[PDB]
């Protein structure tokens, strides 16, 4: 009667924390999280905007 918690399958887990892949840079188990994006880096006006490379880990 619930959407079962995606604790089991890693694919299901990532889907849940990504909201079926909706979340880009965040993962959450909390349904009441206010979605925010990472703040604009202070050097963006100084160094420009770099393409964020996902960490290899």
């Amino acid at each position: 009667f619930s959407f079962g918690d995606p604790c089991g399958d890693r694919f299901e887990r990532d889907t849940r924390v990504s909201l079926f892949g909706a979340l880009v840079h965040s993962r959450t188990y909390d349904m009441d999280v206010r979605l925010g994006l990472p703040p604009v880096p202070d050097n963006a006006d100084l160094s420009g905007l770099a393409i964020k490379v996902p960490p290899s880990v």
Binding site: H25, S26, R27, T28, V33, R34, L35, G36, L37, P38, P39, D42
Partner: protein
């Protein structure tokens, strides 16, 4: 007395320089703390 005076002046100069260096060493942390708290707040906002 002259030898004592000259040695004392040299020692005074060396001690003054050492005290200056010690005060400089003992008086970057703020910047690192600010950076850490900024990183933490950016991480919180992105995760949220």
């Amino acid at each position: 007395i002259v030898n004592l005076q000259v040695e004392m002046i040299k020692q005074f100069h060396m001690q003054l320089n050492e005290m200056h260096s010690l005060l400089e060493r003992y008086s970057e942390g703020l910047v690192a703390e600010i950076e850490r708290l900024r990183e933490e707040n950016k991480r919180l906002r992105a995760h949220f």
